[PDB]
Design a protein around this ligand. Structure first.
Ligand SMILES: *[C@@H]1O[C@H](CO)[C@@H](O)[C@H](O)[C@H]1NC(C)=O
Ligand SMILES: *[C@@H]1O[C@H](CO)[C@@H](O)[C@H](O)[C@H]1NC(C)=O
Lengths: 238, 7, 240, 13
């Protein structure tokens, strides 16, 4: 049972664009109950984000085709579409629960109060993947994950505010995804636009507090915060 | 879909 | 499920980019022993091309890493990489044997002697996947698949030359991939360049025979043939 | 590895 053997396989799999093998390898590493490095934190996020991202992309396409052919009125055709959408939804829910189990039982739990960085990162993922579930959930089921996602981001923000400067790529990443949670899942555009701008402006104010490494990586995220504020405002005026 | 990040 | 629901899942899976599911639907369709339509031939060919194509793309990335890391001298990594490459080789080989089963058992078999268009296509496809195997095979194994790819292409070439217009998309597509086979597998650039040039020239000559229904398809392959001839003739001047 | 261009489609309509 060689760890650095697995982490090699994860990288090797990432190159071959095999994110099922990459996610598998990285899950096995996390199961060793030992803390992940900044590189290993990344290899995990990348791996699973791809695995679930391809499902979400495939879900949006089936939903779109189900919105259009629905008004067409073809019974037998609609059924299989909805059935196929149900197929992909279950694959998606399966991956989210898999990551959330890895988070709640291996990662977030075993993080002391001296590793505030990884704490927020994992807390963000816990919110991200609960949000993926909310995107396809319905009824009282959806309300449950929305609160679960809300509770994950909210806590990830508190730790960020207090121990991380607004110019940190993780705080910028959290604020980015957290806002999207407010606009897309909560449909609270004013609170989403507010959190997006507050995070952005707070990055400007302490702009001189940049490190050479995060100087490019963190600013890449800031433009993303603007792109959303661009698209969000233009929809309200219509 | 609004842009996002994980890295 | 109804045969029409199948093909609709194929169309759907294609749009959702789930080609493993698309290649599965078309496989069920094929096993129904009914001749495939023009759209159904397209759905099948694309579904499996994407499936096997992914393994090829990865295998090239892995075999690439295997050459760059072989000079390092870490026998713990060279093993795990070589082990991975073999994993991808098995997956790829599995798909190829699967399509070739559909071809020889259902498709090519139920083709009457007046279905030249369909037979030329299924054969070209058969030669394609035997060539995929040749890309990862060596020694006697590589020799056997190459011979099988040749036999498929060669037969498809005769039926196309005799029963199809040089502007026909199917006949053009054959001349392309077949020429690729020569240049890559056989490593016979002269035969690859000639077949590509000829199939192109003969298309220009009878270019007035383009039917409106598929002019866009035929025209598209022709670019590839020239883009191929351009790329090839530029690789022979580097070796010299 | 260096590859050429290829095609795998038949005229739908
Ligand atoms: C990218 O945006 C989508 C849209 O909501 C979001 O679901 C996803 O979590 C974002 N990416 C990451 C890595 O968070
Ligand atoms: C596309 O090109 C590759 C490499 O040249 C070849 O192996 C493959 O057969 C081509 N596509 C088809 C459908 O034949």
């Amino acid at each position: 049972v060689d760890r650095e053997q697995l982490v090699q396989k994860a990288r090797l799999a990432e190159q071959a664009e095999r994110y099922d093998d990459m996610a598998a390898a990285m899950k096995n590493v996390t199961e060793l109950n030992e803390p992940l490095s900044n590189e290993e934190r990344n290899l995990l996020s990348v791996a699973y984000k791809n695995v679930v991202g391809a499902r979400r992309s495939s879900w949006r396409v089936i939903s779109s085709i189900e919105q259009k052919t629905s008004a067409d009125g073809n019974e037998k055709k609609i059924e299989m579409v909805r059935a196929y959408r149900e197929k992909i939804e279950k694959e998606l829910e399966a991956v989210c629960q898999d990551v959330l189990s890895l988070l709640d039982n291996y990662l977030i739990k075993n993080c002391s109060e001296t590793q505030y960085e990884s704490k927020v990162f994992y807390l963000k993922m816990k919110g991200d993947y609960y949000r993926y579930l909310a995107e396809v959930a319905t009824g009282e089921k959806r309300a449950t994950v929305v609160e679960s996602s809300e509770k994950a981001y909210s806590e990830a923000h508190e730790i960020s505010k207090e121990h991380m400067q607004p110019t940190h790529p993780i705080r910028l990443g959290l604020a980015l995804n957290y806002s999207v949670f407010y606009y897309e899942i909560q449909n609270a555009p004013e609170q989403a636009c507010h959190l997006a701008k507050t995070a952005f402006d707070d990055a400007i104010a302490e702009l001189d507090t940049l490190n050479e490494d995060s100087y490019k990586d963190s600013t890449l995220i800031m433009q993303l915060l603007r792109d959303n504020l661009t698209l969000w405002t233009s929809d309200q005026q219509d | 879909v609004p842009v996002t990040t994980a890295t």
